[PDB]
């Protein structure tokens, strides 16, 4: 739910485990 990953997903990929892309930002739980 929160952008804890510190990743953006414009292409749509997050590397952080347990991180879901919700374009254009990655969110972890």
PDB file of N, CA and C in Angstrom:
ATOM      1  N   UNK A   1       0.788  -1.214   0.000  1.00  0.00           N
ATOM      2  CA  UNK A   1       0.000   0.000   0.000  1.00  0.00           C
ATOM      3  C   UNK A   1       0.825   1.272   0.000  1.00  0.00           C
ATOM      4  N   UNK A   2       2.014   1.220   0.549  1.00  0.00           N
ATOM      5  CA  UNK A   2       2.854   2.413   0.633  1.00  0.00           C
ATOM      6  C   UNK A   2       4.061   2.294  -0.285  1.00  0.00           C
ATOM      7  N   UNK A   3       4.559   3.417  -0.840  1.00  0.00           N
ATOM      8  CA  UNK A   3       5.717   3.427  -1.770  1.00  0.00           C
ATOM      9  C   UNK A   3       7.061   3.208  -1.033  1.00  0.00           C
ATOM     10  N   UNK A   4       7.081   2.195  -0.197  1.00  0.00           N
ATOM     11  CA  UNK A   4       8.223   1.829   0.630  1.00  0.00           C
ATOM     12  C   UNK A   4       9.393   1.333  -0.234  1.00  0.00           C
ATOM     13  N   UNK A   5       9.072   0.828  -1.410  1.00  0.00           N
ATOM     14  CA  UNK A   5      10.057   0.243  -2.313  1.00  0.00           C
ATOM     15  C   UNK A   5      11.087   1.282  -2.765  1.00  0.00           C
ATOM     16  N   UNK A   6      10.635   2.504  -2.986  1.00  0.00           N
ATOM     17  CA  UNK A   6      11.509   3.539  -3.472  1.00  0.00           C
ATOM     18  C   UNK A   6      11.765   3.335  -4.940  1.00  0.00           C
ATOM     19  N   UNK A   7      10.744   2.852  -5.619  1.00  0.00           N
ATOM     20  CA  UNK A   7      10.819   2.554  -7.015  1.00  0.00           C
ATOM     21  C   UNK A   7       9.638   3.135  -7.747  1.00  0.00           C
ATOM     22  N   UNK A   8       9.866   3.468  -8.962  1.00  0.00           N
ATOM     23  CA  UNK A   8       8.859   3.945  -9.830  1.00  0.00           C
ATOM     24  C   UNK A   8       8.634   2.905 -10.887  1.00  0.00           C
ATOM     25  N   UNK A   9       7.457   2.826 -11.401  1.00  0.00           N
ATOM     26  CA  UNK A   9       7.214   1.871 -12.400  1.00  0.00           C
ATOM     27  C   UNK A   9       6.494   2.486 -13.569  1.00  0.00           C
ATOM     28  N   UNK A  10       7.271   3.113 -14.411  1.00  0.00           N
ATOM     29  CA  UNK A  10       6.763   3.708 -15.608  1.00  0.00           C
ATOM     30  C   UNK A  10       6.688   2.623 -16.662  1.00  0.00           C
ATOM     31  N   UNK A  11       7.668   1.735 -16.623  1.00  0.00           N
ATOM     32  CA  UNK A  11       7.707   0.576 -17.496  1.00  0.00           C
ATOM     33  C   UNK A  11       6.837  -0.514 -16.887  1.00  0.00           C
ATOM     34  N   UNK A  12       6.761  -0.511 -15.572  1.00  0.00           N
ATOM     35  CA  UNK A  12       5.867  -1.409 -14.892  1.00  0.00           C
ATOM     36  C   UNK A  12       6.568  -2.526 -14.162  1.00  0.00           C
ATOM     37  N   UNK A  13       7.781  -2.288 -13.689  1.00  0.00           N
ATOM     38  CA  UNK A  13       8.497  -3.312 -12.956  1.00  0.00           C
ATOM     39  C   UNK A  13       9.162  -2.758 -11.698  1.00  0.00           C
ATOM     40  N   UNK A  14       9.015  -3.494 -10.624  1.00  0.00           N
ATOM     41  CA  UNK A  14       9.578  -3.167  -9.347  1.00  0.00           C
ATOM     42  C   UNK A  14      10.487  -4.326  -8.957  1.00  0.00           C
ATOM     43  N   UNK A  15      11.605  -4.045  -8.362  1.00  0.00           N
ATOM     44  CA  UNK A  15      12.549  -5.088  -8.023  1.00  0.00           C
ATOM     45  C   UNK A  15      12.428  -5.518  -6.581  1.00  0.00           C
ATOM     46  N   UNK A  16      12.014  -4.597  -5.729  1.00  0.00           N
ATOM     47  CA  UNK A  16      11.819  -4.864  -4.312  1.00  0.00           C
ATOM     48  C   UNK A  16      10.842  -6.048  -4.123  1.00  0.00           C
ATOM     49  N   UNK A  17      11.201  -7.044  -3.299  1.00  0.00           N
ATOM     50  CA  UNK A  17      10.326  -8.180  -3.015  1.00  0.00           C
ATOM     51  C   UNK A  17       9.057  -7.744  -2.274  1.00  0.00           C
ATOM     52  N   UNK A  18       7.930  -8.259  -2.708  1.00  0.00           N
ATOM     53  CA  UNK A  18       6.672  -7.919  -2.096  1.00  0.00           C
ATOM     54  C   UNK A  18       6.233  -6.539  -2.482  1.00  0.00           C
ATOM     55  N   UNK A  19       6.605  -6.130  -3.651  1.00  0.00           N
ATOM     56  CA  UNK A  19       6.291  -4.818  -4.113  1.00  0.00           C
ATOM     57  C   UNK A  19       5.435  -4.941  -5.341  1.00  0.00           C
ATOM     58  N   UNK A  20       4.370  -4.212  -5.369  1.00  0.00           N
ATOM     59  CA  UNK A  20       3.458  -4.257  -6.456  1.00  0.00           C
ATOM     60  C   UNK A  20       3.499  -2.939  -7.205  1.00  0.00           C
ATOM     61  N   UNK A  21       3.545  -3.016  -8.491  1.00  0.00           N
ATOM     62  CA  UNK A  21       3.513  -1.851  -9.314  1.00  0.00           C
ATOM     63  C   UNK A  21       2.102  -1.316  -9.412  1.00  0.00           C
ATOM     64  N   UNK A  22       1.970  -0.055  -9.159  1.00  0.00           N
ATOM     65  CA  UNK A  22       0.758   0.654  -9.368  1.00  0.00           C
ATOM     66  C   UNK A  22       1.156   1.924 -10.060  1.00  0.00           C
ATOM     67  N   UNK A  23       1.234   1.820 -11.372  1.00  0.00           N
ATOM     68  CA  UNK A  23       1.788   2.845 -12.236  1.00  0.00           C
ATOM     69  C   UNK A  23       1.305   4.242 -11.883  1.00  0.00           C
ATOM     70  N   UNK A  24       2.218   5.202 -11.862  1.00  0.00           N
ATOM     71  CA  UNK A  24       3.615   4.988 -12.221  1.00  0.00           C
ATOM     72  C   UNK A  24       4.566   4.791 -11.000  1.00  0.00           C
ATOM     73  N   UNK A  25       4.054   4.285  -9.878  1.00  0.00           N
ATOM     74  CA  UNK A  25       4.867   4.150  -8.654  1.00  0.00           C
ATOM     75  C   UNK A  25       4.764   2.712  -8.091  1.00  0.00           C
ATOM     76  N   UNK A  26       5.793   2.244  -7.436  1.00  0.00           N
ATOM     77  CA  UNK A  26       5.751   0.937  -6.817  1.00  0.00           C
ATOM     78  C   UNK A  26       5.257   1.064  -5.382  1.00  0.00           C
ATOM     79  N   UNK A  27       4.456   0.130  -4.941  1.00  0.00           N
ATOM     80  CA  UNK A  27       3.930   0.156  -3.598  1.00  0.00           C
ATOM     81  C   UNK A  27       4.120  -1.186  -2.939  1.00  0.00           C
ATOM     82  N   UNK A  28       4.551  -1.160  -1.717  1.00  0.00           N
ATOM     83  CA  UNK A  28       4.734  -2.342  -0.941  1.00  0.00           C
ATOM     84  C   UNK A  28       3.690  -2.348   0.155  1.00  0.00           C
ATOM     85  N   UNK A  29       2.670  -3.160  -0.048  1.00  0.00           N
ATOM     86  CA  UNK A  29       1.547  -3.335   0.890  1.00  0.00           C
ATOM     87  C   UNK A  29       0.712  -2.064   1.007  1.00  0.00           C
TER      88      UNK A  29
END
